[PDB]
Structure 1
Amino acid sequence: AGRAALYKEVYNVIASDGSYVNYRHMALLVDVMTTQGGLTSVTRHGFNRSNTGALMRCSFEETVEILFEAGASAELDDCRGVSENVILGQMAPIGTGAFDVMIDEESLVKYM
């Protein structure tokens, strides 16, 4: 019930100025703040205090403090995040990078 009420509140604020943004954009945002079984803010005490990759979290608003916790608990990052691959300088798993291309030798022979 809170989620739907949250959407209604956000929509009114945006619509009050006469602008218009598609429904799905709010739906995603309002959803994200509630997937954790509660009203998780998007501040330093909300989204940041997640269970995601530490290397990703450390770039938001607390960096050195987070790194210390990660070392102490020997946390591990799967590098599946976007920012993680940005730091490592690799192709992020997004858009053109969410899949792999391979060469089919069978078709290669056929194309002759």
Structure 2
Amino acid sequence: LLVDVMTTQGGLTSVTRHGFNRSNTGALMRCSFEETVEILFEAGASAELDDCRGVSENVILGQMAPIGTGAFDVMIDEESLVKYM
């Protein structure tokens, strides 16, 4: 998995602020690693839109990340609930 992440862009992407952190993966989760304020300024100037799919975005917003137990939605079924009694 590590070497697949490092080579998935067609070249050797280092684990450094000049490597993985330069992708277009979301401003809020990119700024949480390094170069926070510069990333925010560039996102403001370019008007980037954050889909809030990352773990870091929901951690910042204090909401259940779509990971592990949050990777799905639990819903009540009216018909089954009536069916039980």
- Do they superpose with TM above 0.5? yes
Question: Rg larger in 1 or in 2?
Answer: 1
Give the 3-state SS of the residue equivalent to 1:102 in structure 2: strand
Which segments of 5 or more consecutive residues in structure 1 lack a partner in the other structure?
A: 1-27
Match of 1:53 in 2: 26
Give the 3-state SS of the residue equivalent to 2:15 in structure 1: coil
Greater RCO, CA 8 A, separation 6+: 2
Structure 1 position 104 matched with structure 2 position 70: no
Residues matched between the structures, number: 85
| TM-score for the superposition, normalised by structure 1 | 0.75
| TM-score for the superposition, normalised by structure 2 | 0.98
Give the deviation of 1:44 after TM superposition.
1.0
* RMSD of equivalent CA atoms: 0.5
Give the deviation of 1:61 after TM superposition.
1.3
State how far apart, in whole Å, the 1-side matches of 2:76 and 2:10 are. Answer: 45
Same amino acid, percent of matched pairs? 100
Q: List structure 1 runs of 4+ shifted beyond 4 angstroms.
A: none
Which segments of 5 or more consecutive residues in structure 2 lack a partner in the other structure?
A: none
